[PDB]
Amino acid sequence: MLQQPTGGYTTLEQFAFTIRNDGTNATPTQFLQLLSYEATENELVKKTIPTPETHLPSARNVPGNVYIEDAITQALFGISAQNVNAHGYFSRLSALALPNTSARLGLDGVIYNSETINIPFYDPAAVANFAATYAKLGNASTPRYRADMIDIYAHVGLELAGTDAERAAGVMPVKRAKFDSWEGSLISLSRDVVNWKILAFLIDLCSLEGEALRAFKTRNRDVFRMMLFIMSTAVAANVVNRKVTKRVDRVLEYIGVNSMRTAGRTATITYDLSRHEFAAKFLQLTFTRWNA
Amino acid sequence: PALLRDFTQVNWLNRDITNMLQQAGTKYGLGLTETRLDYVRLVKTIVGHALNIDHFAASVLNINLRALMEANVTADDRIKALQAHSMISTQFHGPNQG
Amino acid sequence: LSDDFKQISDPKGYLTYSVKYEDQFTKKDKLRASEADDRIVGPTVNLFKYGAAVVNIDLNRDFFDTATGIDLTKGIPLVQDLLVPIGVTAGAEQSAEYVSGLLMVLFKVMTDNRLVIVGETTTPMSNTLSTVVNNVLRTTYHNNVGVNPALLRDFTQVNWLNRDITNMLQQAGTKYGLGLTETRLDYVRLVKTIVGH
Amino acid sequence: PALLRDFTQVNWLNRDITNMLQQAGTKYGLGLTETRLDYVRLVKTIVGH
Amino acid sequence: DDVGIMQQKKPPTVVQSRTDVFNEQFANEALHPTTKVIFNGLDVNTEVQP
Amino acid sequence: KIATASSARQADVEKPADVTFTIENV
Amino acid sequence: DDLDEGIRMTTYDQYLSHIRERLHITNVPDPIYITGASTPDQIAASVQATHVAVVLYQSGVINGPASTYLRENEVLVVMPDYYDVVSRFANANLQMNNNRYHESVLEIADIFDQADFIQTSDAVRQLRALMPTLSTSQIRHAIERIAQITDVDSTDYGKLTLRFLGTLTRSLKMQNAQIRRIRPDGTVLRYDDQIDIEAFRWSRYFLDELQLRRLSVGLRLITNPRIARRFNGVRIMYLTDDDPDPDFVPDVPEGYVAVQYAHRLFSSSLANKRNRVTYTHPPTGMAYPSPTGRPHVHMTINERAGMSKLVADNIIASVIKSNWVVDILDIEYTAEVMTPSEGYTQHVDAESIMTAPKGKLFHLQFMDGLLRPEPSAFDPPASGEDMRLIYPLQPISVARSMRAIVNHNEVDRPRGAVAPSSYEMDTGTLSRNGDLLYSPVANG
Amino acid sequence: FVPDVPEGYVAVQYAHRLFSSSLANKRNRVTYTHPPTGMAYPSPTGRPHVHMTINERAGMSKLVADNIIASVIKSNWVVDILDIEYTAEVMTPSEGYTQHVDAESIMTAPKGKLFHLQFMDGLLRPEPSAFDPPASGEDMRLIYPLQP
């Protein structure tokens, strides 16, 4: 068991989040510098996020080692992820949420039901905290519990596109993102984000408190903004190239507006409706936690 | 000719080819490679193979593929060109717009 | 001599892998192992071929034969007319058959007097084998290798599988090896030397 | 009639019979109950059905 | 992930044909997954676009 | 062409031990 | 207190049947009875005497130092019965309660230190727990069957073939039997090394040493989870076919009320000029003639046996219309796991699930939809909805070693893909004595 | 009898744009996006209680009409089609229903078709005998008038 550092697991260099910038490694923050925004006439007012349902999926015992990290990252960032709403993985997740469970979440992101000493794993109190909320991803599909798939993206815009004045205001113009870019810039960016061990991120988000958690939200704002970026590219109504002085500039329109696009395209990853429900629920929980 | 290396029984040739290929500035490689376009879809994933072919043809093939890739033709486009050729209030249905 | 044992070569297990395939899946690229690596790794690879829906671990139907009264078509052992009602015919597909099956499994195992003898073997030269296979092979090995998922390593074109198997086998706690090995019983005689594979 | 219990579709009857059978004073049964083996042969002789 | 090409196997497609009035009963309902469908003529996308 | 499914299970090969007449050591 | 912690105790019948003969066979004094007046030191003298840590309970409330000695030393109290157990112990903290225990099998090896007289394990008891109680003739039938399978001529076995009295079958059952000398009175004598031969000491279930050595391995085989492929209980729930995995059990929704099935719940009633099969909700007491509009209900059916076709059709109708969830524990079943291309070869109407005889093995089939390639972008939309009724209550894929041997993308794993377990590949070494082992986990 | 729309249903004008094919769980389901929340509902089964009004059937996809009736059944949609004209016959219980109007034809006939619905007056229906066993089944009525 890896004891959690006072600043969270993400302080460890083992969990550094990085993305290739036309093939060279870079911090997410230095990618976000590339983005620039042409505002349009429309506005995004952020609605209050409804408080997430208390009901966790039942902690039913299941065969095998469930791979929770790959499941989440694929459902959010992978190219055509499948069976993202299958119940078994989150059944095991809620099993992790029990006060004295035998299950462990390894740094591999796999949930081993054994007390397997050979593989290092996160501190059980921390993952209990983490599953205690994220098991709710299991009710992304159930009609009773579906998150708003439209208004929630307003928040995404603010946390990505939004200037500090716009963020404190809670309202921003709908924006058109753009950056100097390579072929497959958006796809490859997603491929880099998908390899992120976001379990370290979510576990730190759920287990850290007070000054440590605040320092975490400040230190990791750009990371969260990158994941948000990948979602916005999955839902952007249109994504195109603008040649300018022998330099292509990728353009995504629009940030903060879920188009509910489901059909696949070359430019970016795409959400089928099940992926829409999943991501929307994900954002419901994650933003609820982020704004506390 | 890079494939002649350590196979041609012409010694001096193998020596010269081995030299050019041991230079930093030149690296023969053939087969599947990691393009910026890897994992991009267009009904099927795009991939790249270093191939024994003249650079002009390769350029034209890359140009064609990239052209198709950027076209973003969707069903909405065809539906619209159908409505243009149909009685004024015909409704069309079926495929996802995108 | 008394026939205390049933000397045999190339033994069958109590358990075997079963495997269902969705045939529409097929890797386009065609893998080309050396003939030796195909001789060892191959029976595994044909079994766990691309597009295999699920691999199971059923009891060996070949070993628990119809001779033991056992059926194994449904996943469980079954034996008719063992635990039955008296004065009436037992109903068809009775659940009690499963319990009967277990006894006749246990019985058939308590009475398993097979004695292994080395079968045909091969001693591949190291150069013929890809290094990943040579690291598993221990000089000689039976020509009838069985299957084992550890043999899929660097041969399965299923990337994630090769990644997971390579991980489990790069763990300290697990070491696949096949073929002849140094047992405490090496060089002991009993008309012929004992050896271990 | 004790066999009608939880088999008859008539509810009041099934209730009543269930009550009578759940009394301490009354218990239906369908023997065999009493076996009696011989003292020498050790096989059953008189049995109480 | 790839789009299928060979004709895929499908669940049996029972066609409920609900009218003004009807006596719904559920004896011998199938337990396997099944496609309830209300109309007969649902091969409606005829006009092919080359 | 219709999509299809198939099964496989590992084959038995357990023969009675061969009676060789050769011997490997002096 | 963990369930493992507490005061161990067992019934006298178990002690006679499994413990006491071994004490007799080891030449130790019979373990002391414990009355109310029992110092822990006496218990220590007894436990060290028998080398066994067992004390029969005689009578009276047991004083607390004795109790704490029994708790701290894991002495096994042997008691006549389980009525009013707490009254047999002083309760200084009143923590003890008759309903508050934890029943569990306890292998004889954990009690005795002498391995020579211990042939089996928990697994046999577990297997016997699988068996129906057998009348003596059924036992004879089983023995004759096994004999016939092994090609033995077991005719006249267990029988007297008197010339005048005819053939007479004796009972074959003789569980835990021993060879013992009898006094001429006919009463049994304790085994004595002085007169009876050593072979008679312990019957060893009358099996050869080799057969025992293999019996052990076999018991480990029979009680493997992966062999345990006969399943109990089926959830019926009207629900869209979504989860790819065969092993899916839909969770019961937040609003449902658990309700045991009972014939008393269902009845005839007037309702708009029809004799409808009304169900009266046990909490509210309200009667609902129609399958439509009933309160959400997690109904459990422990046994379908007397249930009328009307009520069964009506419960199914409630599953479809009121969205009842009806678990049915009576059912035992096997489960072939189909792959999408092979479809559903067999079929089960709800009528048959509600009316199949108990003790028949149902053979349900469950698709693993994980290897279902994405639909063509240009396939027509489905106006309708695929549905499903039958679900397992328990994991089904116990036999499954691996799953979805294909690539999502060319590099990602498909969700729900199963890698082989590491132990499938461990091939460690032989133990110092001969037995198989996994490799060491760490260097130490 | 004209059944009332239950409290908490949402009035929703039909328009072609509310429905579209969309990918969901490896099938191209005929999804409905709900104009209040905006959320898409790929399957008929989970949809919000909706009192949809169809002022005019014309131009509607047949798959969409089928999906709407399916929502009427599995999500208890209450869908009022104002385009329809029909005559009525009040059958006595003794004569029973001599005709039936399929919902398919109701959602797919050209405007100006004149339907002939029939309705039972149940007032004179016989009472069941007191001891007679209940029959299996439930009578149902999918189509209703908006007027006396």
Author numbering:
A (entry chain E): 1 to 292
B (entry chain C): 298 to 395
C (entry chain C): 150 to 346
D (entry chain B): 298 to 346
E (entry chain C): 100 to 149
F (entry chain C): 74 to 99
G (entry chain C): 841 to 1284
H (entry chain B): 1088 to 1235
Task: Copy text verbatim from the article accompanying this structure deposition.
Viral transcription is highly regulated, as demonstrated biochemically in viruses of the Reoviridae. mRNA transcription in these viruses is activated by external actions, for example, removal of their outer shell in multi-shelled reoviruses and binding of S-adenosyl-L-methionine (SAM) in the single-shelled cytoplasmic polyhedrosis virus (CPV). To reveal the mechanisms of transcriptional regulation of viruses within the Reoviridae family, we determined the cryoEM structures of six CPV/ligand complexes in the presence of magnesium ion: CPV+SAM (i.e., ‘S-CPV’), CPV+SAM+4 nucleoside triphosphates (NTPs) (i.e., transcribing, or ‘t-CPV’), CPV+SAM+GTP+ATP (i.e., ‘SGA-CPV’), CPV+SAM +GTP (i.e., ‘SG-CPV’), CPV+GTP (i.e., ‘G-CPV’), and CPV+ATP (i.e., ‘A-CPV’) at resolutions ranging from 2.9 to 3.1 Å. Like the atomic model of unliganded CPV, the atomic models of these liganded CPV all contain two conformers of the capsid shell proteins (CSP-A and CSP-B), two conformers of the large protrusion proteins (LPP-3 and LPP-5), and one conformer of TP in each asymmetrical unit. We discovered that the large sub-domain of guanylyltransferase (GTase) domain of CPV turret protein (TP) also has an ATP-binding site and is likely an ATPase that mediates the activation process of viral RNA transcription and capping.
Except for A-CPV, these atomic models also contain ligands revealed in our cryoEM maps. To test this hypothesis, we first obtained the 3D reconstructions of G-CPV and A-CPV at 2.9 Å and 3.1 Å resolutions, respectively. Our structures of G-CPV and A-CPV show that, in the absence of SAM, neither GTP nor ATP induced any conformational change.
